[PDB]
Amino acid sequence: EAGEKTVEQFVQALNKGDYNKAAEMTSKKAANKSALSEKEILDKYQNIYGAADVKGLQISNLKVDKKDDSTYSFSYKAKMNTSLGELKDLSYKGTLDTTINWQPNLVFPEMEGNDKVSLTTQEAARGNIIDRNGEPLATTGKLKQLGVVPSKLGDGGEKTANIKAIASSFDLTEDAINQAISQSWVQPDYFVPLKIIDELPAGATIQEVDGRYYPLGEAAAQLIGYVGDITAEDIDKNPELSSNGKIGRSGLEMAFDKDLRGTTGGKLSITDADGVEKKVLIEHEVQNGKDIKLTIDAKAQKTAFDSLGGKAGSTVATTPKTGDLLALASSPSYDPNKMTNGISQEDYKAYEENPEQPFISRFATGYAPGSTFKMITAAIGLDNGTIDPNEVLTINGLKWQKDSSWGSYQVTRVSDVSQVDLKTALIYSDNIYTAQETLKMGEKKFRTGLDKFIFGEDLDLPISMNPAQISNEDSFNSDILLADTGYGQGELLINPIQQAAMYSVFANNGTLVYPKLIADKETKDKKNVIGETAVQTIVPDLREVVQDVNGTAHSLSALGIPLAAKTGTAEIKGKENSFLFAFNPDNQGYMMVSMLENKEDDDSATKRASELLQYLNQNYQ
């Protein structure tokens, strides 16, 4: 009858922690109907379940018959979550009076009379994400935790005045302080945690508590990611997750959650009235999460993020001969510490509504590579024999088009240099030279040179990422699209990591070295991507891009360090992105690609790259 509804509500009240209503659905105390009073059932359920942090109690196979004229029996299978994992396949049985004749059979299947529960949980320590030199990127730190002692809080209006004072001095609703103070585990003299603080009234104290901590903060927020309290929804996906631990929601905290979380150790069992083991429900051994060391340099990461100055952009720093990802900075960013602990709705809405989008991992976002890609188009042209470094094109003005069939579109350069060869085009960042040489090269030869790269490949990196593409379809279907792809801004989509991968060929004499994030990983490369002669022709021109007084990266020559560089721009609609590629041509110890997305006028990726270049030249030979 309607007794099935009485069982559904009973499991629903137990599922969300409401033990008083669940106990209110029980029958009066007797020997035929119910074994305890409602308060006794309340205390038993709290003491047992809440100690085990029982959440996500879900039932199935619910069958309800009718035993006598006023009794109806019921049975169902149940699944539970504890600090020790999932309790699946649990057979519950009992009677109905519609009320519930409660027996200790309904706490755990095979308890009877005055049986107790043994919960010994003592373990867990999430693995640490450390940099290439052992510096912490995601460890456990001592955080400041403000909470309230109910006894030292006051009586009557004193308590209300102090609650309003604490709620006003730290921005929290009065109802939160009163709800945490009135929760069922709290005692008058216990420390009730309220918030973690990034003038303490009567009752407010602050403790030092272990918690997930990110030393670099926003500087590595996109890469490392952040952690969050496990919900019932997450327990639905993976059963072995403890119902109280933390789970990585983004970045490497999520990509490596199984390797970093370990397994909480303990034993949940049922004992008799005299404490002798009856049934072992759950038991596992303590296993802390495994630490994960990356190729990231802590100081290089911090410097590459600070150099972006909060503007929209990204910076990737590698050791091109091995592929070690020294730095993966994305700006703007968010506070991961304030994200894992206590984040207000207003601040999270400010994060999500920011047009610059601090949440996106810009180092893994496909972009038009800009006129930097000129290098690639040059190398291909030097491999197939299309581009003679000696030949000089006569270019008049700042705009050019193949013919009047382009209508209103023209390729734009910045410097009106009449005689332009390859070295001059690299020094002045000439887009017209590149467009003309690309059109003379043809689509077939250009795509032949391009397919020697990593277009369409899915890199072996623990970062969510889409493979780089040359264009939308397999053919350009347009001379304009071919020319624009020539100087790196058509339907091209290459994220900064893939950009560094492709550009590594100039530091390995034509061999592409795939980027590496895990330090233990072996070095994988791809040989004969571009010819050796193309490298030995372009790299000195890339030196001239810095040394010549009209090189677009001449401001770096003041640093007095061996640099081979190439600037770039990309117009999308108008919005303009700035690019800088730079590496040590003497020892190939480091390589760097930086980007300013939708740059402010007078701003450039080269204007902010000096300090990172100095650090990399000092510490990576």
Extract the tokens encoding 454.
Answer: 């990593």
Distance CA 55, CA 52 (A): 9
Q: Which of 350, 275, 263, 298 is nearest to 115 (CA)?
A: 275
Produce one character per residue of 364-390: b if its CB has 16 or more CB atoms within 10 Å, e if not: bbbbbbbbbbbbbbbbbbbbbebbeee
Q: How do 129-130 and 292-293 pair as beta strands?
A: parallel
Half-sphere exposure of 159 (CA within 13 A, CB side): 13
Contacts of 244 (CB under 8 A, 6+ apart): 53, 83, 229, 230
As a whole number of angstroms, the distance between CA 566 and CA 561 comes to 15
Catalytic residue among 269, 333, 371, 604: 371
- The number of CA neighbours under 13 Å toward the Cβ of 540 is 7
What is the distance, to the nearest Å, from the Cα of residue 357 to the centroid of all Cα atoms in its chain? 14
Kindly state the tokens that stand for 619.
């510490």
d(CA 276, CA 278): 6
Answer left, alpha or beta for residue 449, where phi above 0 means left and psi between -120 and 50 means alpha: alpha
- Residue 247 host element (H or E): strand 246-250
Burial label, 563 (beta-carbon count in 10 A; 0-12, 13-18, 19+): buried
Count of CB atoms within 10 A of residue 121's CB?
A: 21
- Annotated active-site residue 557? The verdict is no
Residue positions counted in the chain: 621
Active site residues: 371
